Amino acid sequence: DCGYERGPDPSVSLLEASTGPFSVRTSNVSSSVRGFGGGTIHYPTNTTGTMAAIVVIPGFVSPESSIAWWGPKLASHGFVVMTIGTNSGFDQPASRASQLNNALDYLIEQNGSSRSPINGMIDTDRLGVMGWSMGGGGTLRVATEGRVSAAIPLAPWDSSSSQFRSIDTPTLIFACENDSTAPVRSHADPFYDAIPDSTAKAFVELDGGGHTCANGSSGFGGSYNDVLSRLGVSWMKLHLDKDQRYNQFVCGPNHESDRSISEYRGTCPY
Amino acid sequence: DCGYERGPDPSVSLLEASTGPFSVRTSNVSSSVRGFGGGTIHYPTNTTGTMAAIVVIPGFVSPESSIAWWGPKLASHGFVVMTIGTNSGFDQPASRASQLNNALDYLIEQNGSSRSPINGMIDTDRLGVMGWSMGGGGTLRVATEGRVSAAIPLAPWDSSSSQFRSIDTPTLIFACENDSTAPVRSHADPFYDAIPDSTAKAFVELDGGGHTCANGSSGFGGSYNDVLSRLGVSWMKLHLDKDQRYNQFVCGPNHESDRSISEYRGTCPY
Numbered sequence: 424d425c426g427y428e429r430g431p432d433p434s435v436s437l438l439e440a441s442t443g444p445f446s447v448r449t450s451n452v453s454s455s456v457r458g459f460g461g462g463t464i465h466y467p468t469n470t471t472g473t474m475a476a477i478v479v480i481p482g483f484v485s486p487e488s489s490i491a492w493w494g495p496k497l498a499s500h501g502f503v504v505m506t507i508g509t510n511s512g513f514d515q516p517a518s519r520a521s522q523l524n525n526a527l528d529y530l531i532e533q534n535g536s537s538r539s540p541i542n543g544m545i546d547t548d549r550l551g552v553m554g555w556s557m558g559g560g561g562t563l564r565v566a567t568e569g570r571v572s573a574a575i576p577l578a579p580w581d582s583s584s585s586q587f588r589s590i591d592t593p594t595l596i597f598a599c600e601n602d603s604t605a606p607v608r609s610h611a612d613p614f615y616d617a618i619p620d621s622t623a624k625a626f627v628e629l630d631g632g633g634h635t636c637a638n639g640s641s642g643f644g645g646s647y648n649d650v651l652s653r654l655g656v657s658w659m660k661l662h663l664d665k666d667q668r669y670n671q672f673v674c675g676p677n678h679e680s681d682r683s684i685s686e687y688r689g690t691c692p693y
Numbered sequence: 694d695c696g697y698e699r700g701p702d703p704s705v706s707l708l709e710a711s712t713g714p715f716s717v718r719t720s721n722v723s724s725s726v727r728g729f730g731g732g733t734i735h736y737p738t739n740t741t742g743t744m745a746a747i748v749v750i751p752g753f754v755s756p757e758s759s760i761a762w763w764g765p766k767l768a769s770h771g772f773v774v775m776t777i778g779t780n781s782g783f784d785q786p787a788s789r790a791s792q793l794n795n796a797l798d799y800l801i802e803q804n805g806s807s808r809s810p811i812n813g814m815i816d817t818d819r820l821g822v823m824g825w826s827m828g829g830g831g832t833l834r835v836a837t838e839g840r841v842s843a844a845i846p847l848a849p850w851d852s853s854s855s856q857f858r859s860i861d862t863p864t865l866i867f868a869c870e871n872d873s874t875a876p877v878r879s880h881a882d883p884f885y886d887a888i889p890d891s892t893a894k895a896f897v898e899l900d901g902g903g904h905t906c907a908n909g910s911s912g913f914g915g916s917y918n919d920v921l922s923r924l925g926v927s928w929m930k931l932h933l934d935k936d937q938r939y940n941q942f943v944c945g946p947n948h949e950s951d952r953s954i955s956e957y958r959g960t961c962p963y
């Protein structure tokens with residue numbers, strides 16, 4: 424109804440393809456950028472119209488590289504995706520939340536900058552956040568604030584869960600079953616549980632996943648890319664683009680029948 | 694020569710055994726302990742004489758459990774080993790160094806405490822430190838100080854390497870080949886390189902190892918336990934006990950011919 428739909432009527436095959444329908448380019452953000460540690464703006468080059476913006480933030484002492492897989496992946500599906508680094512690897516979730524916000528602000532700024540290749544490409548109303556570990560805690564925190572329209576914490580790490588009762592943002596938590604850094608039992612699980620059941624939410628625990636299981640990979644350890652692409656892209660399509668054509672990949676499937684998904688929870692329908 | 698030798702003339706089989714020659718017990722250290730986040734004192738129960746004390750410290754936002762494997766492992770070979778937690782998961786290497794020192798101090802204190810099961814069991818002159826990731830940075834930092842007689846950083850993470858030119862302590866760095874949290878190229882390798890070649894040192898990169906590869910494991914992913922036990926126990930025996938019977942396991946073998954060791958460097962002979 425909102426007219427943000429882009430690209431073909433999707434298919435699992437489209438979602439699990441190495442890249443989405445759009446060619447992607449990258450634009451550097453120096454670490455001199457205010458409010459975060461720089462990053463890479465990934466954007467599609469053969470789309471029309473404006474598109475939602477997504478910031479993907481790493482976890483503790485982790486560089487952008489840790490979550491960079493998500494940039495081209497999501498951008499290829501019709502999003503401006505800035506994978507970023509943090510001011511310090513030591514940044515805690517609250518700081519990462521602030522930097523997520525700063526990075527979102529930055530994409531909004533760059534959307535209006537003649538020097539940016541995404542100038543005029545972003546519907547700045549339509550903002551998604553993603554983040555690994557402490558960055559996933561930051562993501563969940565940003566998901567409480569009412570600006571972003573989708574949040575995908577990746578193996579989130581945070582220090583308390585009750586703050587996330589304020590999440591009305593559609594939040595898909597990728598959990599890593601065997602996460603020993605942000606153990607599901609003390610992080611992804613209570614964070615997910617804290618989110619109101621009225622919130623569009625999903626808990627996708629990746630079978631056998633260690634702490635990096637939801638970061639994607641382009642070389643070794645790519646075994647979760649299908650579910651990450653399928654659910655993550657659809658999540659962002661569904662909630663950032665209001666693209667109901669992607670609903671069926673997040674609400675409908677028996678996710679746990681996926682060999683890569685050890686546990687699924689969600690509040691379907693959305 | 695120093696008379697600290699304990700246990701039988703070793704063999705690889707002894708070193709790679711599930712446990713060393715000694716039964717171990719554990720004694721709890723509440724997190725209320727001053728100067729670190731509590732821990733577990735592992736000590737052998739059917740030993741005679743005093744033994745060196747080892748503190749094993751975890752990395753960022755990691756609990757003692759992350760490195761706990763080393764407690765029983767080393768204790769069973771004739772050491773008092775306290776696996777500890779940190780005050781905060783957010784503690785940085787310098788703080789972990791201080792907590793390593795506090796934990797060492799604590800073992801020295803407990804050695805003189807009628808309430809400690811290791812009272813009178815510790816030769817407080819003979820101190821080893823081990824630590825994972827930022828705890829390994831802390832370990833390397835403590836290794837600069839002149840009090841400890843052996844240091845085993847496990848996939849160490851730290852923010853600068855030049856400080857480690859001050860390491861005269863026998864330092865065995867376990868590196869994890871595919872570490873993406875403390876990339877060998879920017880952590881274990883320059884930390885090892887910074888140590889003077891006059892220092893007894895070793896760099897043991899575990900083949901295919903992720904960031905936890907040097908932490909040990911009981912069942913799930915235990916594929917490095919042999920090299921960790923063989924080289925780690927021998928390191929501590931050699932340098933804490935001056936037990937030259939263990940020298941041949943650290944100086945002599947073609948370490949890289951071990952299928953678990955992707956790279957070895959060292960300053961043999963010691």
Ligand SMILES: O=C(O)c1ccc(C(=O)NCCO)cc1
Pocket residue numbers: 481482483484485555556557558580604634751752753754755825826827828850874
């Ligand atoms: O043992 C460590 O020092 C250590 C453990 C976990 C992290 C981490 O959380 N990495 C993912 C991003 O948060 C960093 C360091």
